[PDB]
DNA sequence: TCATTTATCTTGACTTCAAGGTAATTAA
DNA sequence: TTAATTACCTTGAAGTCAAGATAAATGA
């Protein structure tokens, strides 16, 4: 039995007059998730690194040189509002990863690019996510890890069109 | 997906890596943030945020008279006390729980609902089932079997580490 | 007793968001 | 040109955590 299977069954103790069903697929997620950011957080810090920081990092790494975003492009992406985005990139440009550009083409947009400095970080804190998610992974026969892609996938597909 | 997306891209910056475990990862991490954003629309029509429900859940999952322990919940949601100690009294102030001292514990002061509460979370979770149900439904049954059974075996290899 | 642990809160700080603000941009 | 919209930041406020503190329970 899992944990999840645990909170059913006092849910099926408290309130048999219930289906919780729905919630075995949803509470199991939910866990893994909140473990699996536990895992690679653990790794991030042995970079100096939280959790956001990185992702800020390797969106812009992701994007191709020069490495230039804007804030807009940004939060866009990484779901979080305007406000958020101000405090994280006031941050990163503290800690030189990230060097403020202003846009020729509007100017209320003042974008955010990658330093030296911060593309190195990326360039190898990269090697090493990929290779401790491959290690979480591992754990999974090669059949198991093949379904729950196929799977997710489906699921994310469901949730992104509503 | 939006997850083939970031794949294609370090397909391109850095063809030396193979990035396949982003796959995987990557889909669970953005479901369980569409998944809460579904789950929170509906704790909103009861007043409630997800940290209340889940509080009050657990609470009410224990079983009669619904007194749990600061450290089993924290334990239990894993935040830490401080967390806690500040959410407990959100929740007092919102006449959801009572806090009874412990007789056999001095340095313990037990959370219990109140008839307030009981009532609140007695039919919220009744609504949440619902709202999963259809949230689910989108999902084939062999499909939904699959991703369960699937969900499972990674959580055994977590928990166990 | 005691030197250590446990239960729980207190403080300072960081991240986040909703709401507002303001300089540019836009289409008529 | 203007009224509406976009880009980005500012400002309170809430939630969270990490240390730290202090009363209470230990087992020797």
Redesign the interface.
């Known amino acids: 039995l899992?944990?999840?299977d645990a909170?059913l069954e006092?849910?099926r103790?408290?309130?048999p007059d219930?289906?919780?069903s729905?919630?075995?697929?949803?509470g199991?997620?939910?866990?893994?998730?909140?473990?699996?950011?536990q895992?690679?957080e653990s790794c991030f810090s042995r970079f100096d690194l939280s959790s956001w920081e990185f992702d800020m990092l390797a969106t812009l790494?992701?994007?191709?040189a020069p490495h230039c975003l804007s804030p807009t492009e940004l939060f866009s992406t990484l779901?979080v509002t305007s406000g958020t985005m101000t405090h994280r990139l006031k941050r990163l440009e503290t800690r030189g990863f990230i060097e403020r550009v202003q846009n020729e083409l509007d100017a209320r947009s003042t974008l955010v690019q990658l330093t030296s400095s911060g593309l190195e970080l990326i360039?190898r804190a990269?090697?090493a996510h990929?290779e401790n998610?491959?290690q979480?992974?591992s754990?999974?026969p090669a059949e198991?890890?093949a379904?729950?892609?196929t799977?997710?996938?489906?699921?994310?597909?469901?949730?992104?069109?509503?």
């Open positions: 899992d944990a999840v909170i006092q849910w103790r408290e309130r219930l289906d919780a729905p919630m075995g697929p949803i199991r997620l939910r866990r893994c998730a909140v473990l699996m950011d895992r690679l790494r992701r994007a191709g779901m360039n990269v090697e990929i998610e491959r979480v992974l754990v999974l198991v890890l379904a729950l892609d799977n997710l996938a489906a699921l994310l597909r469901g949730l992104e069109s509503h």
